[PDB]
């Protein structure tokens, strides 16, 4: 199933993301569950916007807000949810919400898959039109769920973004 | 997988519906295996219609015509097959065919998901025209399918509902 | 999972297709993996195709390229990928890549889901059309990664077909 999905084939700078949200969809926010590994509605979002990425999380990983690593993936054509995408990070969106911090990494395409994102080895070299529509996403989608906010405070490389894989890997079991 | 989705966090007020067909998709007919738990083509269907909600089922439940409790589920925007939405059941379209009777439930997603159907708590909140609509599907889908009939009784109540819920679970128990 | 799907339940009239792109689609090219059985995306295509029909694979089967049997199955409407369709051998596109001559049989919607494809016994009741364009897609589409070819060598009947599913169904397993 979905749960016996490696974090990555060779951590940290070529993983696989599971997919919950294609990149320019419906506003349904989906989530693989624990025990079935299937993919559930988690929400119906209710601001007028899409992701401007595929949006997913590394398996048998954990940040400090309780749930793995996500990651946003970038791709030509939007793909399916609940399907896995071998990928290369190369950023890292620092945000904080309520409470837990909340990074939001960005991986590419694997060159295995696709040469179109060999030029994209750090941050700067994603297009700054992009950077700006996750950073505004983030920043907005939440605004109509009382109680919730999001302050975007800024992006980080791909060392920062391999950091914070091996980091939550590891808070990866052990305890 | 799709087999280890728990029929309910809290029957039968608060359900899991397993959605098989989205609402207003292409005339695919699909179904869970019992054995994969993979969502197959059962049918291309023959008349040109298509289902008014999501179409689903209650995992872990057995209604008397062999099969789990089918369950419509209303959304804002159509659900990808083979996902999990939990709802909140609120009616019954009481119907027989061929094999039997065919009781159909209507859900709408629970209140964590979104407050859009908090207003809707029995099947008379529900707009005449979707109530109408499913009726009249149900009435007809088969039409081109020889040997096949439908004849619709009516609308019961969330607790009519409820009680098919926990009717068909219990009697959930045989292979 | 989509693992444990038999490879037919009748080999060879009768079988079970897993679908890992359907007809008409973005470009994306998935795969299911053998440990997780997951859909991955395998690679973006970079010609400018779609698969004229949907296109799959026989669970528990071994080409000699190292690989399950690719069946073509089409369909009045596309299928959701990582869905199975129960259907039947009607021919086989013979052609050669290498490493590993690469065989694609075309196998039609079994009767029990739709009598659409009743008539089509044998590879030469498809339309000129559809093969035409089959055997023009596989001539082409890897025309744009370096070192890959494809010859397409001609058309066999579906005993032919049936052959491919028995020989590589035993290949497998057995060592």
Redesign the interface.
Known sequence: ??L??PAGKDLPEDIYV?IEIPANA???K?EI?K??????????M?TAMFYPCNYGYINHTLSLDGDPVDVLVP????????????CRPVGVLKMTDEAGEDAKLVAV?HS???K?YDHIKDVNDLPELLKAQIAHFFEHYKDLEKGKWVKVEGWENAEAAKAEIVASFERAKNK
Do not use: M
């Open positions: 199933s979905l016996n999905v599971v419906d506003p349904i989906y569950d025990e079935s590994g299937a993919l559930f509605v988690d929400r119906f209710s791709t030509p054509y939007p793909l399916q949810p609940g399907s896995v995408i071998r395409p295995k898959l696709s179109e």
